[PDB]
UniProtKB/Swiss-Prot annotation, chain B:
Organismal lineage: Eukaryota, Metazoa, Chordata, Craniata, Vertebrata
GO biological process, alphabetically ordered: snRNA transcription by RNA polymerase II; snRNA transcription by RNA polymerase III; transcription initiation at RNA polymerase III promoter
Key words of the record: Nucleus, Phosphoprotein, Transcription, Transcription regulation
Assembly notes: Part of the SNAPc complex composed of 5 subunits: SNAPC1, SNAPC2, SNAPC3, SNAPC4 and SNAPC5. SNAPC5 interacts with SNAPC4.
Name of the featured protein: snRNA-activating protein complex subunit 5
Parent sequence residues shown: 1 to 49 of 98
GO cellular component annotations of the record: nuclear body; nucleolus; nucleoplasm; nucleus
Swiss-Prot record, chain C:
Result for mutant: Q14L: Abolishes SNAPC5 binding in the absence of SNAPC1. Minimal effect on SNAPC5 binding in the presence of SNAPC1
Subunit note: Part of the SNAPc complex composed of 5 subunits: SNAPC1, SNAPC2, SNAPC3, SNAPC4 and SNAPC5. SNAPC4 interacts with SNAPC1, SNAPC2, SNAPC5, BRF2 and TBP.
Organism superkingdom: Eukaryota
Resulting phenotype, Q14A: Abolishes SNAPC5 binding in the absence of SNAPC1. Minimal effect on SNAPC5 binding in the presence of SNAPC1
Cell location: Nucleus
Function of the protein: Part of the SNAPc complex required for the transcription of both RNA polymerase II and III small-nuclear RNA genes. Binds to the proximal sequence element (PSE), a non-TATA-box basal promoter element common to these 2 types of genes. Recruits TBP and BRF2 to the U6 snRNA TATA box.
Annotated disease: Neurodevelopmental disorder with motor regression, progressive spastic paraplegia, and oromotor dysfunction: An autosomal recessive disorder characterized by delayed motor development and developmental regression after the first year of life, followed by progressive spasticity with gait alterations, paraparesis, and oromotor dysfunction. Most individuals have cerebral, cerebellar, or basal ganglia volume loss.
Gene assigned in the entry: SNAPC4
Impact after mutating Q35L: Abolishes SNAPC5 binding in the absence of SNAPC1. Minimal effect on SNAPC5 binding in the presence of SNAPC1
Species this chain originates from: Homo sapiens (Human)
UniProtKB/Swiss-Prot annotation, chain D:
Origin superkingdom: Eukaryota
Effect seen on changing G89V: Inhibits interaction with TBP
Protein name per UniProt: Transcription initiation factor IIB
Species for this entry: Homo sapiens
Cellular compartments annotated: Nucleus; Chromosome
Effect noted on mutating K31L: Reduces interaction with VP16
Subunit composition and interactions: Found in a ternary complex with TATA box-bound TBP. Part of a TFIID-containing RNA polymerase II pre-initiation complex (PIC) that is composed of TBP and at least GTF2A1, GTF2A2, GTF2E1, GTF2E2, GTF2F1, GTF2H2, GTF2H3, GTF2H4, GTF2H5, GTF2B, TCEA1, ERCC2, ERCC3, TAF1, TAF2, TAF3, TAF4, TAF5, TAF6, TAF7, TAF8, TAF9, TAF10, TAF11, TAF12 and TAF13. Associates with TFIID-TFIIA (DA complex) to form TFIID-TFIIA-TFIIB (DAB complex), which is then recognized by RNA polymerase II (Pol II). Found in a RNA polymerase II initiation complex. (Microbial infection) Interacts with HIV-1 Vpr.
Shown stretch of the complete protein: 159 to 314 of 316
Gene symbol of the encoding locus: GTF2B
Domain notes per entry: The TFIIB-type zinc-binding domain is necessary for the interaction and recruitment of RNA polymerase II to the core promoter, the formation of a fully competent pre-initiation complex (PIC) assembly and basal transcription initiation. The C-terminus is necessary and sufficient for interaction with the TATA box-bound TBP complex and for the formation of PIC.
UniProtKB/Swiss-Prot annotation, chain E:
GO molecular function: RNA polymerase II general transcription initiation factor activity; RNA polymerase III general transcription initiation factor activity; sequence-specific DNA binding
Subcellular location as annotated: Nucleus
GO cellular component: nucleolus; nucleoplasm; snRNA-activating protein complex
Record's subunit section: Part of the SNAPc complex composed of 5 subunits: SNAPC1, SNAPC2, SNAPC3, SNAPC4 and SNAPC5. SNAPC1 interacts with SNAPC3, SNAPC4 and TBP.
Section of the entire sequence shown: 5 to 234 of 368
UniProt KW keywords: DNA-binding, Nucleus, Phosphoprotein, Transcription, Transcription regulation
Stated name of the protein: snRNA-activating protein complex subunit 1
Phosphoprotein in keyword set: yes
Amino acid sequence: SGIVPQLQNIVSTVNLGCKLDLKTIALRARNAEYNPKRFAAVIMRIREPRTTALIFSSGKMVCTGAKSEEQSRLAARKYARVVQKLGFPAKFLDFKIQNMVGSCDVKFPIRLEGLVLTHQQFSSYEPELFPGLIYRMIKPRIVLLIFVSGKVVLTGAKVRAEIYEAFENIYPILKGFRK
Amino acid sequence: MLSRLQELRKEEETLLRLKAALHDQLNRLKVEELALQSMISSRRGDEML
Amino acid sequence: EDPETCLQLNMVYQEVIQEKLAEANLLLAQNREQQEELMRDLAGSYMGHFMKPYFKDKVTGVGPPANED
Amino acid sequence: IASACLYIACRQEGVPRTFKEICAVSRISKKEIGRCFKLILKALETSVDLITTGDFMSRFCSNLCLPKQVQMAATHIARKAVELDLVPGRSPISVAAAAIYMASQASAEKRTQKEIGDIAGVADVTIRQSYRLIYPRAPDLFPTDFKFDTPVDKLP
Amino acid sequence: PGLQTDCEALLSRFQETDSVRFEDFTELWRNMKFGTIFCGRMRNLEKNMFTKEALALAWRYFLPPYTFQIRVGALYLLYGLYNTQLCQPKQKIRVALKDWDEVLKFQQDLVNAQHFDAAYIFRKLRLDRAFHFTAMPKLLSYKDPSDRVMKLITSDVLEEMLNVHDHYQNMKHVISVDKSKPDKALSLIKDDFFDNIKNIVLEHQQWHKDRKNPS
């Protein structure tokens, strides 16, 4: 239809290109946490694009939380500059957007029971485990959490076009089951 | 208060049934009205000659 | 004779049934308002919450600081 | 894997139990049961039909000391409630517990939310939440020919 | 404590007479010895508290959604209670504001129906100043009802409906240019409207009786 999903999250990774001493970064960065009894990365937050970078001792950074590809690239470069200033030989190699969670609302209640009955080979609907139907789209390798309130959460895409084509594929199917 | 609540809801379903009947009557009435307009146009068309 | 009388009598019949529809829809409005009153009763709620510190945060639940008095 | 297979078999035969009725027996948490259940359905390339509310009724009403009349009552209530969309997107077990609570408080043998929560494996808060959804439409859900000693026009 | 039962008993023994005359209520008052509902030892505090409860209950029955017969019965009950009290500063009937415009139209319907007994009783209550014209009854802190279906449909409504319908048919028979058969554009009138509304009201009253019949 005319509604398109709003990207809510974008997970990207980057190779800083040098081994890091996480204790140093956690002692000198501005918003870092380092609980090596809970996870093995330094969790830095920033405010300008509102993203969270997990920085690893191998030099591989994971910037999550952005709402666009460009914001994610800018945030990753920001964390790169941060670790640079801390006296590390950090560069910006191999930036890759690894996930894009978009959301949307088709604005009509849906019959999940009928949908899983007619699409048994894709959808998984277990109301005991999750109140939403999990539709594994196959043309783009996307996963949709479709709910009875009409909300549809697309996730798993590497490119925004994948999110868009997945929602375009799923919209007629839901229109067929308009409660 | 569920006694009163169910009395009120039963009245509600009854009055919805009455509204359904009267609305069908209204729709068929306006269809008759359009039919009348069409045929009177056709019949006054036979005296403007 | 001439269906103009058909028009006028069908119009007055539409008028009386439209008065009936307005009355019935008003009863529907009053009954649905009664239903919503029942639901706000189910969703209604104390007086201890208004004791000695009458004002209090919805966050922490502590009163304002002391007056100068 | 054994617990997930037990659950899948119980579901396939047409007498499905809940994960809480397999975790209650197995030594692993419901989380792992559900994970391995999805993994098994993925591996075997098979599927299992969706549970309905009428599947958990011959067992819930029998584990409770309810008569057969109250059992068919709650069956009818739950089936009509899921029919009339009073409970959208809520798990069939909670709807079953709510319907059983309604038909129990209406009939001779009354059961509280606690006992029904223990049997069905549903938190009493969920019973409340999905009972308030079928609370106003109580009479048109019940069976027409239904004897009782507590007026269906008054229920908590 | 049991007072509502006596109130309902008197109102039922009254409505079973299908009468509005206050003489019948006087006969029931003397028969039930209802006036001695206050007789008996009790100190001033509990006495006027009980009187408050009784007047509030009778007034509650005086208002909708009760039948006209029940309402006139409750008006007579209010007269009999307020006039026979043991409290020296007689307790007053708490009249909310939102109920005044309904009580006034009820009094007007009483005097229009020439029910001068009940209308005179209400006038006597308003002259003796037996009312506290409050904002809400029941100071705040912290049966036989009337249906909407009779306001919708009754005998005269369906009578006028069938009159308009058969007049509509008789004018159909004359509008057509030929007397043998009407036009083929006007045959959409429904004959089951009476039958449909009859089915609806009969299902309603049948469900109503199988409701008031117990299991």
